[PDB]
Structures are given as structure tokens and as C-alpha cells.
């Protein structure tokens, strides 16, 4: 009856009783980190809350109902969907233009939770026209607390890739990200770059739109930002770009991206080490001049070091970086690899339980021997000298057909 | 006082947020 | 026109031509990591591939069509959905008992991709009865490559939490997980434990089902498995369980769980350090006996060390672990923290950008001073000697109202 | 040769897998 009385009092003609009841509902949803959302929905309070959103004559009541609806929309998809089905979104879009700042901001917060539910709720709110008035809040005078909520909604607008947001929405969001990437607040900068990382993870056409925005020269130097939160997001965003074409990759390289990577391969955090090698693996998958840029940047010995001593996640990306180079590189670039003693630590990975890593190393060794027309003898002994030949022989006993067939063909052709 | 584990993606970019008191 | 010809030939009365056409379609989907799924869907080949699944008179054609449909279902949700709307699932389910092993396995693979799309497709395949014949494949004679695909589908049956799988499905899966957790293959062990981690992240009632299965005494010792992939999955699974009630937490503790954590707190991997402290923070949020078990296991000095010298992700969990203890512990248990020199590294976190961490530390400091009846003076001196008092005073000017109000209350009450 | 970034959850538990040639 406590919940039932609160619902009845939320429709009271007495304004003091009505405001107190909506507050009591809000506090049930905000007093702890396990709110009773389903109980309040079944009590019948949703249509009353959506209804208080129209009370322009009582801003205090509008604010409390928007707060209560914000927390209901923060729950499961079914609970977020109940707020949608109550037709609250058109009223939240109304309140973006409220003269009262706390009402306007809470409506942004509520819409962000609905947008964050998934692509279909995102596209419903987009269809009603949320993006333009949202970006209109970006101004010199906006409070910093409010702007952090605005950039959080922008992240939610970019974050679902199945499907990505419509192209028109991306073309509206990108000029706003170009403004925000120069902000000195760390949280806004982190959100801005994560938003870019979601847009660059959406395919090559979206990558080109990010490039055409002109934002890449202002993104690459963030690889050496003091804050590791910014570095991690920037490494992800530029890492996604270099998954595109050779030209798109060259744009990132022409912003001096490789200069930042000595400090990234030696960074304290293993996660940055792994993503940095993953980045480089996509450069050694490029053309021969991009392979040469990695060589000229003196990054190969640091890759081979992590291939040997790094954690298994990083060693895995390092094997890809080496194996990619054996497919794209010239003979003199692969010879540079042999001179840097890639053979022993490369072969040491042949005994791991990850069948993909074993296949990557076997593919690389096959390409190395096929490429060294005259020096295949020297390389063949180097492989046996470190115990690699013994490991190739036992991989003939492997469960995977692609692996044991390649082990057979390697020994027949070169041993 | 119990807290569920938040993934790395939800750490830096939470999809949904309630406003706490 | 080659695509149109392949589609035409896929309906040929000439069995050689039909098999080659379906093969050519499969090849387009399997020859690289960027298959043209949309082109094949638009070509009209889906209902022809589905009809090939009915050809019990040609197992080779059945296998090739199942492989082709498997890869279409491995794409976007709309592409997985196009296979569903072609009514392929009932035919895949009847192919689970084909006399031909390769046809059977490929049907399991295709169904796993549909289940992996989301909860709605998962429940559709469950509604048609996939779980029982899937688990019937678990036997002493099953080839290990097939078993890894079965356990992968079992992971996909457990992986979505909005909503979780039906209770009836979980009760069917748990006895299979009890069998597989004794397997010696690492990949099957890792899949089995990750499936448990998904089930234990679904709420306290699913946690009780996992406990009632009797599998916890066989999960906890995997915290010290030789393979770090197993340790990581096991730490996640038992970490989810101790997010439940005090009784559910005590089940894990009575399996000697805390004896594994010295090696987890000093492990080379930072992520293991962080999630191990997260585990311990949920133990210090328990009753006073569980707080005492952490103290008796000699873990507090290791927590305080990581609070001082760990990466920031681990420092946050350590701040939670200390702050949780100040709420639940006795006075002699909090006094033990002071003797273990908690004050300096605890206060050193007051200057981080994370507003949640600052709130956590302020809450802990306030709790500490309130429970030190006479020793509030000694502790107040310790807080100022390390610079903590200076940091609390400047937090009175913080942009967060919860933070600066508590900063004032601490100074008003104790300084 | 280009490889997209696979999350930590999808590395140890991929939701969808195609069979490659």
C-alpha cells in the first residue's frame, strides 16, 4: 500500500502532496544501487510521471518526474522500453527547450539512457530530432557538469554498430567532435575520443568521413597525452583507422603517428603494449613503404622484444605483426627481420595451445623460407638451431588440418 | 555494499546511468 | 552474372552441377575474412540452400549448404535474421541426428551463430528444443574438435543477460557443466568456466542454482590452475558469486578460496590483480566473520600495498575494499587497518580525477574517525601528517555536492 | 591482412564464428 499510496498521491490536486509523492517515488529509484524498478512500473506510476513532464506550471514537479523516469530508463531493456511505450520521448524533447536549466539537463540524461539501450531505440530518438538541439547546447557558457552529460549522450549515439547510426547523424556529430577535441577537460576529451573510436569501428566509409572531417591531425598527438585514459582511447581510434585502406592508413602515418610508439611499446600498462603492437601489425599489413616506415622508426627490435618477453596477449599481436610483414614486405625487409634474430622467439610460440597463433607462425616461417631463394639454407639451419624443426615435426600430429598440412609441406619443401 | 564487475567498455563509456542520491 | 549463374545452377537436376554451385557459394563466404554476405542474400540463394538441407539423399550437398548458411548467420543481426526467416532452424535441428558426423557438426555450428545473435534468437532456438540433443553429444567417445563446438554453443546459451535464459534451460545446462569442469582439455575448461561466469552474473537466484548444482568446490581450486586463461575465468566466476548474499559468499570461503589470493595479488598480470582486489572488496562488504577471514589470511598488507603502488584500476578496487571494511568491520578490525599503515596511501587518492574514488575515500575516512572513540585524535594527527587534511580542505571547493558536503562534515566533526 | 580489434570478452568467448577455408 506504500507504493499504492504514493501512486495515488502522485495525482493529488494538493501540490504539496503531489510533489512529495513524486519525490518519494524518485527516492525509491535513487536511494541505493538496486532500485525496485519493476515494482514501480506494475504499480501504475509510469503514465503519471510522463504526465508530470507536461506541467510547465510546476518546474519542481517536472524535474522530479524526469529524475524518476531517468532511473527507470537506466534499467533493463524491458524497463527502458516501458518508458518508451509511455510516450515520454516527445515530452523529453520538449523539455530540452525548458527555461529551467535543471529540467533541461535531466531530460538530456533521460534521453541518453534510452539511446544507450540499443540501435533501435537510438534510431527512434534520432527520428524525432534529438541530435540538432543536443549539439546546440555546446557553447562557451555551458556548465562543465552539463557538457559532460551532453558528450555522454553523443557517445551513446555513436556506440552501436548493428547498424551504425544514419549517415546524416554522423555528419552532424562530427563537426561537434572537431570542436570538443580541443577541450581541456579530461572527461570531455575522453568521451570525445571514445565517440570517434566507435565511429571508426563502423567500416571504411565511416572511416573516410572521420578523415574528411579534418580531425585526424588533432587526434594522433593525443597518443602522448599525460592522461592514460586519453591515450587508451586515442590508440583505439587511430588503431581502427589503420584497419582501412592503404591511403587511409597513410593519413595517420603522415601525422607522425609512429613517433609515439617507442613510449607505447614500453608503457607500464600491458593493455597499451598489446594495442600498440596490434596497431603496428596493421601497418606491416600495408604496402612496402609503410612496412619501411616501421623499419625506419626503429620499431622492429622492440616488436621482437615483446614477441619474446611480453605477455601472451602482446606476443600474439607481435606474431601477427611479423607474419604480416612476411607477406607484404620486400626481400630486403624480410632479410632485415632475420638479421634482427626474429627466428628463435618466433619459433618458441609454435607450442602454445592457441591454434590461430600456431597457424600465424607457421604461415610466417613458410613465407620466410619461400622468399630467401639463396639463403633458405642458412634460415633452415637457424630454425633447427633453436629447436623450431623439432616443434614443426610434432605439429604434424596436430588436430587441425590446416596446421599439420602446413607442417608437412614445410618439411618436404625445405627440410 | 556488493558491487558487480563492470566491463572495461562500461568502465569508460557506461551505456546507462541512474542518478543517485 | 556469375552470382546469378551460381544461383541458377544451385537448383540443377545435374547433381555434379548443383554440388559445384553450392560449393562456389560456400567458397565466397569462406575464402576471406570479409565475405560478401549481402550480395548472396540479394541473389536469392537462401531458400535454395535451405532446400538443400532437406536432401538426405545427398549428404555432401547437405554439408556444403550447412557450411554456407553457417557463414551467412555469422554476420550482422539482419544477416543472421535472414537465415532465421528462411525457416532453416527446424532443418538444422533435425540434422543434429544425421548419420553423417560432418553434417551434424556443421548444424551445431550454424545454430550456435543464431543463438549468439541475442536473447530473442536464443529463446527461439531454445523453444524448438535445441538444448537436450545438444547436451546428448557429450560422451566419452566424442571427438575433441566437436566437443569444443558443443561447449561454445553452451557458452552462447548462457552469455546474454537481458533476459537470462529460462530457468528450465539453466537447470539442463548446469549438470553438463558439472561434467565438463573435470575435463583436461584447456579450451573446454575455459569455455565451461566462462559459461559459469555468465550464469553467476545473472542475479542472486541464478547464483543459488549454481551453488545448488554442487559445482563450487570444483571451481574454486581452478584459481591456481597452471593456465592463466583458466585462472582468469575462474576468478570472474567466483567473483560473481561473492556479489550475492552473506551465505552464498560463505560457500565460496568454505572452499578455501582466500588461500589462492596471495598469488593473485602478486601475479604479473595487472588485470588479475585488479579483479582479485574486486573479489576481496566484496568480502570486506560481508559480515564481521568474513572481514576477519580476510585479516587472518594475511591479505590486508597486500591490499594496502596495491592501494599504494598498483595501477589506478587496482587502486580503485583497493579503496573500495578498505572503505567497505570501515562500514562492516568491528572497531578492532578497523584499528588493525591503522596499525597496517592504511592512512597515507588511502588519503593519497583524494586528488584523483575520479569523483567516485574520492567519495569512496572520504566515506572511509569519516567512518574511521567516527568509530575511533578516544583515538580520533591520534588518527586525526596521522591524517594531517601525510597531507590528507590539506586535501580534505581543498575538496570543500569541489564541483560535486556530495563530495564537498562530506569534506565540510569531516572537518567540522573532527578538525 | 587488416584485422579489426576484438574486445576482451569476444577474444575468449566469440559470439559468432564463420568457418574459413
Residue numbers in the entry:
A (entry chain B), C (entry chain A): 71 to 485
B (entry chain C), D (entry chain D): 1666 to 1686
Sentences from the paper on this structure:
53BP1 (TP53-binding protein 1), a key player in DNA double-strand break repair, has a classical bipartite nuclear localization signal (NLS) of sequence 1666-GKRKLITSEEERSPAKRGRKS-1686 that binds to importin-α, a nuclear import adaptor protein. Nucleoporin Nup153 is involved in nuclear import of 53BP1, and the binding of Nup153 to importin-α has been proposed to promote efficient import of classical NLS-containing proteins. Previous studies have shown that Nup153 is involved in nuclear import of 53BP1 and that the interaction between Nup153 and importin-α is required for efficient nuclear import of classical NLS-containing proteins. It has been proposed that the extreme C-terminus of Nup153 binds directly to importin-α.
Here, the ARM-repeat domain of human importin-α3 bound to 53BP1 NLS was crystallized in the presence of a synthetic peptide corresponding to the extreme C-terminus of Nup153 (sequence: 1459-GTSFSGRKIKTAVRRRK-1475). The crystal diffracted X-rays to 1.9 Å resolution, and the structure was solved by molecular replacement. The asymmetric unit contained two molecules of importin-α3 and two molecules of 53BP1 NLS. Although no convincing density was observed for the Nup153 peptide, the electron density corresponding to 53BP1 NLS was unambiguous and continuous along the entire length of the bipartite NLS. The structure revealed a novel dimer of importin-α3, in which two protomers of importin-α3 are bridged by the bipartite NLS of 53BP1. In this structure, the upstream basic cluster of the NLS is bound to the minor NLS-binding site of one protomer of importin-α3, whereas the downstream basic cluster of the same chain of NLS is bound to the major NLS-binding site of another protomer of importin-α3. However, no convincing density was observed for the Nup153C peptide. This quaternary structure of importin-α3–53BP1 NLS complex is distinctly different from the previously reported crystal structure of mouse importin-α1–53BP1 NLS complex, in which one molecule of 53BP1 NLS is bound along the concave surface of one molecule of importin-α1. • Although the quaternary structure reported here could be an artifact of the crystallization process, the data enriches structural database of what can happen during crystallization of protein-peptide complexes, and will benefit researchers interested in protein crystallization.
